[PDB]
Amino acid sequence: MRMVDIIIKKQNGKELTTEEIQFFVNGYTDGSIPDYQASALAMAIFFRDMSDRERADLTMAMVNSGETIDLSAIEGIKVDKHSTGGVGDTTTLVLAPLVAALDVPVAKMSGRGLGHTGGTIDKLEAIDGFHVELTKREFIKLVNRDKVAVIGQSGNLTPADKKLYALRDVTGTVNSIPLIASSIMSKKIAAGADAIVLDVKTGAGAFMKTEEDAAELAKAMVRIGNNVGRQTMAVISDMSQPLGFAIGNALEVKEAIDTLKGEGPEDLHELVLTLGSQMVVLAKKADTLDEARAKLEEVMKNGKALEKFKDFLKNQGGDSSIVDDPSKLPQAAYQIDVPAKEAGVVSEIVADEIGVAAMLLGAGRATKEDEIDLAVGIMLRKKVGDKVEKGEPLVTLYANRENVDEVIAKVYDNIRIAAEAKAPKLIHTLITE
Amino acid sequence: MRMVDIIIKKQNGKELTTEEIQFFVNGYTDGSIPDYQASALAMAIFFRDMSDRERADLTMAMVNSGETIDLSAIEGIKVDKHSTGGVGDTTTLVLAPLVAALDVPVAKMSGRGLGHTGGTIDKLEAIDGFHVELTKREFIKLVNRDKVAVIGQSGNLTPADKKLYALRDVTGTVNSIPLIASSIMSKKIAAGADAIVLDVKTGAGAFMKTEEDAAELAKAMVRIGNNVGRQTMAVISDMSQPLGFAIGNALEVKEAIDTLKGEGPEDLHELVLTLGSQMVVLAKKADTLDEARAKLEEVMKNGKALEKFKDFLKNQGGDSSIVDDPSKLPQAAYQIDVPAKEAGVVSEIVADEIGVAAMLLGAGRATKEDEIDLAVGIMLRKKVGDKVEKGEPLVTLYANRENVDEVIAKVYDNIRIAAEAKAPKLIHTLITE
Ligand code: NA
């Protein structure tokens, strides 16, 4: 009735009103408005775009479509990192302890979910005894005291976004700057964050396939965050190749422990710092990025970041001695190398497919009620740019299974070697203002 | 997925192939493809548009989506006319006998439908005893014998177009040159016509409301016709004001009778000849529009037009004495003049709203559950660009009801008077080749 007019407005490129947008969102949420109108409207948006102002109102409408987490009791400026997927991305594990060591409040809400590897709870619960068996008041007290904690995600956060994305996927309206940017910021504002850091991924193995688009989507999200009082910043990092060497769960925790001691991979280290700096700044604990970086690099060297991880673990029941002795983490039975069939420099490592290969070991959930094996995964022995002689291992598979032929195969199909090869820029672009 | 890829292809301005299009049409018709995909696709069509090849494939996809009538048993080239909706339009009542009298096979398929006045069949009810339904044999016999017959559109001709229209209407994708050009041509090609004449309206009333867009839609529909070998021509006629004086059913039959004697209103007469000329040329009963026109004007003055009308009425049970004696047509109870409040020239007769006013007397159907009163209607006393004194009748309301104050008010509010005015050119342009 009124939807059809809003669609036609949108066709002509007319900037919708706050109430018009809220009518669609709530009408679509409660089942008043059917999906053929929603999809029609989604495509209309795809072509004629939305203003910075329509974005901010759409974003906020989706927040209010379901529950809103109030973290007013938690003290300080709580900054929340969002990443746009990334194979082997260990930043979340490192960042929460690292940033809390500088008295920045980290109120993590995380899950398990489906993917190449497990969620942050899955990965953390490889630390013997660790749990999220705790209330909201327990959660609030721990963040106020030790500046870090993690609970499970709530059920009903932005059910508008859930249904919209699902429609967008099956109508090809996913790739839209206003819809993506709103969809993301909505989940993070509903989750109760004050400020937000974004890790928008780019490269051959990324959702925003080009840096042109990456920087635009990121810029769109900053301006949304600023237009609703949520100071936002953004990194454009590369994901043509997996981040670090560890692709797994126990493997990635081991790698997080290394980076917490200043002993991480070149790439994971750098990204952790860049992202960490943005957070530390967003909670008024430094003036500029370099000072934050210095402070963060100090707490790596201090072992204070590392002790903040142990505190955090023992606060939630995890055996903190496992941080000191990583070999206590669940071990894989078999340890199988994948040797180069060729000499040269490693030119290409198809991130997602290496991710898939690790999933095939048991490391992630292909379906709703699959079970993760925390021990299994892939440790990269070479990165894009390293030399390699025929027979030298590119990769070591970690399995509780003798037969890994399908996995070895997927590794070879997705690691190319050439005469020369230059590793892409990891950190492309930061967006502050 | 398939459909998603088809949608995305179109998003990027790629030409759909023939198989993709059939898959969609067959899929959406049978129920495989859901409504939200269909709506997202049409919205993609709307923006990126299609090519002549795609339009042709879409058209024919829609033709084959249901049953097809095969008039091959009727000898000669069976040309058919389609008008894009016009208030007071009686050209079909005139053309069918007028062109059949020149030995052009009119195998007309018409419907009742909703709107301002009733359809062609509704109008033909006014001659008592006339009926629409007789057999496909009785249809084929009568056209070979007398070159003229009218039956109902029945079953599912273009079931894809039935469903997709409703979708386009309720999703705001009705105004797309590809979609309507196909929608029109499909239903016509499906009805068994060899050649097609299109009366594409323009002006205040009618869906297309500019001479540029009207020609664009026509040139598209002609091209599709020539592409599929169904030789097609078009008339761009004006419809900012109603056609002739008579707006109704019994009233429009009377007006069509006058026109058949060459005693019609100027505009109706001119539109008839232009449309007729085209039909005669497409039927190979003249080499020249000039020649064709002349034959049609001879047959009007002869009586041969009017005798063919009588023949046609007798063939389908109609009391053909009503032609010779108009007062036999169902008369109206009341006959109210609407006096002008102002001296001047009549500048504006808002065609669609006058059609509504006539509807409010009982001459059309707002909803499917209404019944037409055939007696009622509106006789215009002035056309745009006529001098009118204060107190002179602009309009006469033929009613079967005493209180008609809303109808009077609507007439006043949709007929403006000014110092000077000229009506548009009736015949704007023609698409011959
Ligand atoms: Na890693």
Write the layout of secondary structure elements.
Two copies of one chain form a homodimer.
Chain A: H1 3-12, H2 18-29, H3 35-48, H4 52-63, E1 79-83, H5 91-100, E2 106-110, H6 120-124, H7 136-146, E3 148-152, H8 159-171, H9 177-190, E4 195-202, H10 211-226, E5 232-238, E6 246-248, H11 250-260, H12 266-282, H13 289-302, H14 304-315, H15 321-324, E7 334-339, E8 344-349, H16 351-363, E9 377-380, E10 387-388, E11 393-399, H17 405-413, E12 415-418, E13 427-431
Parallel strand pairs in A: 1-4, 2-3, 4-5
Antiparallel strand pairs in A: 5-13, 6-9, 7-11, 8-10, 8-12, 9-11
Helix pairs in contact in A: 1-3, 2-4, 3-8, 4-9, 4-10, 5-11, 5-12, 5-14, 9-10, 12-13, 16-17
The structure holds sodium ion (NA).
If you had to describe this structure to a student in words, what would you say it looks like?
2 copies of one chain form a homodimer. Chain A is α/β, with parallel strands linked by helices. The first copy, chain A, folds into 3 domains: 1-68, Transferase, Pyrimidine Nucleoside Phosphorylase, Chain A, domain 3; 69-330 and 424-433, 3-Layer(aba) Sandwich (Pyrimidine Nucleoside Phosphorylase, Chain A, domain 2), CATH 3.40.1030; 331-423, Alpha-Beta Complex (Aldehyde Oxidoreductase, domain 3). Chain A is 45% helix and 15% strand. Chain A contains 17 helices and 13 strands. Chain A has helices at 3-12, 18-29, 35-48, 52-63, 91-100, 120-124, 136-146, 159-171, 177-190, 211-226, 250-260, 266-282, 289-302, 304-315, 321-324, 351-363, 405-413, and strands at 79-83, 106-110, 148-152, 195-202, 232-238, 246-248, 334-339, 344-349, 377-380, 387-388, 393-399, 415-418, 427-431. In chain A, the strands form 4 sheets. The first copy, chain A, has a 4-stranded mixed sheet, sandwiched between helices. A 4-stranded antiparallel sheet of chain A has the order 6-9-11-7. The longest helix of chain A is centred in the middle third of the chain and has 17 residues, at 266-282. In chain A, 53% of the residues are buried. The A-B interface holds A 4, 7-8, 11, 34-40, 42-44, 46-47, 167, 170-173 and B 1, 4-5, 7-8, 11, 34-40, 42-44, 46-47, 167, 170-173. Bound molecules: sodium ion. Sodium ion is lined by residues 88, 90, 243-244, 246, 252, 255, 268 of chain A. The site of sodium ion has 8 residues of chain A, from helix 11.
